[PDB]
Swiss-Prot record, chain A:
This is Ryanodine receptor 1. The N-terminus is blocked. Channel activity is modulated by phosphorylation. Cytosolic calcium-activated calcium channel that mediates the release of Ca(2+) from the sarcoplasmic reticulum into the cytosol and thereby plays a key role in triggering muscle contraction following depolarization of T-tubules. Repeated very high-level exercise increases the open probability of the channel and leads to Ca(2+) leaking into the cytoplasm. Can also mediate the release of Ca(2+) from intracellular stores in neurons, and may thereby promote prolonged Ca(2+) signaling in the brain. Required for normal embryonic development of muscle fibers and skeletal muscle. The chain holds residues 2423 to 2471 of 5037 of the full protein. Belongs to the ryanodine receptor (TC 1.A.3.1) family. RYR1 subfamily. Changing R36H: Decreases threshold for channel activation by K(+), caffeine and 4-chloro-m-cresol. Decreases inhibition by Mg(2+). The gene is RYR1. Binding of [3H]ryanodine indicates that the heterozygous channel is activated by Ca(2+) concentrations 4-fold lower than normal. Single-cell analysis of cotransfected cells shows a significantly increased resting cytoplasmic Ca(2+) level and a significantly reduced luminal Ca(2+) level. Detected in skeletal muscle (at protein level). Fast- or slow-twitch skeletal muscle. The calcium release channel activity resides in the C-terminal region while the remaining part of the protein constitutes the 'foot' structure spanning the junctional gap between the sarcoplasmic reticulum (SR) and the T-tubule. Pore opening is mediated via the cytoplasmic calcium-binding domains that mediate a small rotation of the channel-forming transmembrane regions that then leads to channel opening. Homotetramer. Can also form heterotetramers with RYR2. Identified in a complex composed of RYR1, PDE4D, PKA, FKBP1A and protein phosphatase 1 (PP1). Repeated very high-level exercise decreases interaction with PDE4D and protein phosphatase 1 (PP1). Interacts with CALM; CALM with bound calcium inhibits the RYR1 channel activity. Interacts with S100A1. Interacts with FKBP1A; this stabilizes the closed conformation of the channel. Interacts with CACNA1S; interaction with CACNA1S is important for activation of the RYR1 channel. Interacts with CACNB1.
Curated annotation (Swiss-Prot), chain D:
Binding of [3H]ryanodine indicates that the heterozygous channel is activated by Ca(2+) concentrations 4-fold lower than normal. Single-cell analysis of cotransfected cells shows a significantly increased resting cytoplasmic Ca(2+) level and a significantly reduced luminal Ca(2+) level. Detected in skeletal muscle (at protein level). Fast- or slow-twitch skeletal muscle. The chain holds residues 2326 to 2374 of 5037 of the full protein. It is found in: Sarcoplasmic reticulum membrane. This is Ryanodine receptor 1.
Amino acid sequence: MSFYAALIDLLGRCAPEMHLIQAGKGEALRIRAILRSLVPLDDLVGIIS
Amino acid sequence: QFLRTDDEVVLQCSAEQLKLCLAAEGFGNRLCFLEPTSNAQNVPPDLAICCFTLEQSLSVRALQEMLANGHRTLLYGHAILLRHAHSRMYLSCLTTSRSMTDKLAFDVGLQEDATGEACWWTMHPASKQRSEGEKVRVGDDLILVSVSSERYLHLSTASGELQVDASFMQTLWNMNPICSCCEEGYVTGGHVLRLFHECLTISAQRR
Amino acid sequence: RLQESISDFYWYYSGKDVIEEQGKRNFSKAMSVAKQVFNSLTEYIQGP
Amino acid sequence: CGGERYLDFLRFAVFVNGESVEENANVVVRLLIRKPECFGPALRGS
């Protein structure tokens, strides 16, 4: 659980910042596709609860 | 002896060892499947949906100012835009997933639009024999990476039989030139043609 | 290897309108070494 | 236990002063997906 606590918050800290998402930086939104593509959201919700 | 622009190629893989050409139907069944060709002696495979013309080829930063906005030979580390010669549309990497196993393996299909998001691919040299800047010779091992998704066009063996998908496994690919610039008034393979002397018809069990 | 490296520097600036100070100092560098190597090329062939 | 002695390093490699960098973040993840064994194998999956 501590290892997966490390694999998660690394990629959270590689998420491109919000002001670059307001601009149409296609490279920056390509990465934000990939990290969202990897992880299902509802997996977190059972973990968060 | 070297590849160029505007000349059709056919992607073929290798897996006993067996050569699978990559074709796709279009106008219905927008996804792509595989088709073998190593058993051409007992059964001729269908090459009608396997032709692919390279109508453009740019550098990596070169298309970057196409998106915000005659025969050039091509190199490793370039970008590429394939066209399905029968269906007059472009190959791309799609949004969905035909894996349904959380493999994060994207599915390869076709696209009608000429937008440059997922239509483009970059090639890469397989070993350290060649590198960036060198030309692609005829019959060299290639690795094709997405531009939008940054995944590799690879064969997948997990779900029963074999299929092609975009995920994080690299797979060798032969480009195999199939038709260069032909002269006018002459015949090559793939030509649809008539046989006059009065045509050569069939009946509309019609044999 | 110099040739593609200078050409892709054009494609980054092909969308921009003006060039700032540091953009030229880089581009002043790459041609100053390019004039050196064409001069070093032609002395291999100045003799017939 | 052993693999967690690298990610605590790399989470100092892209996140500084409560902000993310760009040039390192755009190249760690391009490289982290070349070897998908580097992720934990329960999501490589359960």
